[PDB]
Design a binder for this molecule. Structure first.
Ligand SMILES: CCn1c(Br)nc2c(N)ncnc21
Ligand SMILES: CCn1c(Br)nc2c(N)ncnc21
Ligand SMILES: CCn1c(Br)nc2c(N)ncnc21
Ligand SMILES: CCn1c(Br)nc2c(N)ncnc21
Lengths: 258, 258, 258, 258
């Protein structure tokens, strides 16, 4: 199996990476960061996110593993003390898959893939968009912005906005509001909305057409936008799992007590 | 086809029912409230809920239709002026199905079926339960109570508690909190939780073992409770649909503007 | 000075009480639980609440002190290890005062005093009341109920309902909602409301006239209610303070870290 | 009396302004936009905000009046059809005063006055600040940002963030959170905080020292910030009131029904 390892870049992670590389040398494993089948991230969830986006053109060929050298992460859910055991079993595991979010931006097309979420805010002044669900005008949103989250992304920005946590086996996306204006004149639903596969949520500008669009860590300013279109991606991220670490236990460990 | 019609019992609904019965007489339709295949509710969503629970032993044999003589309802989504057209097509439609919630209460077993939600509060004093997810202890909840909602139930009590609205094609259940106590000593997740099929959420008492349990409109006091167990039911409610009235449009009509 | 001491009634608190009584005997202090000028509560905030309500007819004559034998309390904010130092200075301190909430219930009048909050829920079925502010009809509330909190009460039930914490030097009361129904037909403000002195908030029934009314720990069923009237009381609770323990530090210690 | 009139600049407002100027000419009133004692705003609340900030150096010399040519505003609470009656009584009224918020920014000092609120967000990346209350370290906030609101400002951005509405007779300020991160590692209070006069809330950077600071409509990027300090201002805005239009009625008219 070809493999590669990204590191957070501090002393802890680089030395752990060099030790795992040395451990992999004692087996029949070839280090290749061009066409790896196994991508190991050492650091935190942000390190894992960058690893995912480095190889998002070969998602169907890769199994990801995360090692957290800091606190417990939702994607980096292996302890550094287990790195040797990881090297052992990695050289011959079952795969689990999580859904992803497709974002399409049109001008007068660019598509992005998100593992956590995709957000939209205004660049110049007030944020006003018409929210269209499966070609049906649903609401005119006025506020700070909107956030569309994957299932595994619900524990991240989605959670801080009041969204629900949903198990990653559910093929869905969740839309949450950012500081909406609600009075007798302006009306939004308020509640988070959970959409299934094949449902298309479209954002269409009213006045201003420039928007700051974020996809996970990446945040780009887009000008002369005609439409922002969300849907559950056809592609999935594949993890290499070696033990039972249930999602709800990861949620407990991160937010209740560990 | 055998059929029956329940009415809210006011003048508006009873007269509409008698007119539909007369209209059905002009076809080959036999009124039977014992083994109907078509159950028509005339009134509101509460009238529809009672109709559902009257015949929950024959859910697989029945297609439900709701007529709202008051405001627009989420289950009663036909206007009274369309009753004649309803009678026409009902005598020879496709069926749509929504998931349901199974509640199991154990003592020292009773099972219930919910179309909207099932809630738990304390009878004598403070409400404290341990929340167990797939045999994993998740949290110790202290507050007013908890609510487990079906997908179509998310627009009802679940919404008032801050839960997400989710499309009824998703086979899931959603747990929301009622006024939880959170300090350095007591910790709950806070966020709504969305569970897929085959996940089991179990509530287990800590001190008091008497609970007020509600299932849709029905609210019963239970004594010496050992466990409350939630899961997505294997059974579904079947609707008779004659036109496209999308769920998200029903949501818009009920909460944004109609 | 006359004094008295209430105890939570467990072994820890009773033995601490007997030791303080013995310590007070070594000074010129007379134990009197009929007309005390100093009321010492040993236990938790609930023990302090009962002490407050035991002597609410002589609030202007008494200075209260709380000792927490369990976790840090907002009213019982002395450690048991400081009981000897407390006895010393108590025998000759400055006084601080917190505002209180007056509740008036009318039938076809009973007045109550609250240190934390006063809540209203329905007894038989759905809760619907008209909210009147200084004789101006403000809203028709439909939901689980309402909560009116004192400033020091904002850290208690008010906090679990999403209310703001406000410093107890502000003579005000705060009204929060319990699971309100909001659609195109039914509309509430949603936000917590903070009222100054001399503002009167009145709740008036629409259909059902029986309500479960709570005042701190005390919860009574009232029948044939015509009006529930809230206002900031003219009376205040007086504390004996011996050191600087700021409210915001108590908030930090209870909810952030201690 | 000297007076001046600002206009939203559309056809409706300019023509109303010219008519009021003509009406004022029929009395002994001198138009002076340098040292006016009466400042009339015609348009919306944003027009009123600009009028307030045009003359914030002479707040003690001026009485403000707002006319809303669009929907009902919280500061512009006179209808255009009443402009003639306004001119009449304005030429010889009692004054009401609302508290204001003082913001002080320090580098390696600039002070601002807010009628609605003052917000802080990050410019480059993640927002992390230490919140200090009266020199006591209260929390380390991580999220999108923070908002400190005046009493009359509570109906504006503060409301969209979940803050409480408080009557403008209360001399206070309210701090609300923007999408805070809360887990076992990072902890914020969550609830809105209401501070009285003479309480000082200080924000102190942890890593990044560049912040986007907004004061009402005005939003400025500040670099190398050492401290952001909030307190209730000693100065107040004075309104000219001619009739009883209670704050809670304005709240009802804007959010419940008008
Ligand atoms: C700590 C930063 N972080 C990232 Br990056 N992704 C996530 C996630 N999915 N859940 C929680 N936290 C996350
Ligand atoms: C109006 C009462 N009501 C009932 Br009953 N069920 C529902 C529901 N599913 N969504 C919204 N509202 C409901
Ligand atoms: C722990 C129970 N409790 C009582 Br009783 N009063 C309060 C209060 N004011 N703030 C927080 N918690 C309280
Ligand atoms: C409509 C814009 N707006 C402005 Br500007 N100030 C306020 C305010 N205080 N309350 C509500 N809304 C406001």
């Amino acid at each position: 199996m070809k493999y590669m390892i990204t590191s957070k870049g501090d002393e802890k992670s680089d030395l752990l990476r060099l030790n795992m590389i040395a451990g992999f040398g004692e087996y029949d494993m070839e280090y290749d960061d061009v066409e790896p089948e196994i991508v190991i991230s050492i650091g935190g969830d942000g390190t894992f996110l960058s690893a995912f986006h480095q190889y998002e053109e070969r998602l169907d060929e890769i199994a990801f593993i995360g090692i957290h050298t800091g606190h417990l992460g939702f994607y980096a859910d292996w302890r550094p003390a287990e790195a040797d055991k990881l090297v052992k079993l990695l050289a011959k595991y079952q795969k689990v898959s999580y859904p992803l979010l497709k974002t399409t931006v049109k001008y007068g097309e660019a598509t992005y893939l998100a593992l956590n979420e995709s957000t939209v805010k205004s660049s110049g002044g007030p944020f006003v968009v018409d929210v269209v669900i499966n070609d049906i005008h649903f609401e005119r949103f006025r506020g700070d912005g909107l956030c569309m989250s994957t299932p595994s992304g619900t524990t991240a920005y989605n959670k801080s906005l009041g969204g629900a946590l949903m198990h990653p086996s559910i093929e869905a996306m969740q839309l949450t509001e950012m500081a909406s204006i609600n009075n007798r004149v302006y009306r939004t639903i308020g509640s988070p909305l959970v959409f299934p596969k094949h449902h298309v949520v479209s954002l269409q500008p009213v006045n201003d057409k420039d928007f700051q669009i974020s996809v996970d860590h990446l945040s780009i300013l887009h000008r002369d936008v005609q439409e922002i279109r969300y849907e559950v991606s056809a592609k999935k991220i594949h993890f290499a799992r070696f033990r039972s670490f249930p999602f709800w236990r990861r949620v407990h460990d991160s937010f209740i007590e560990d």
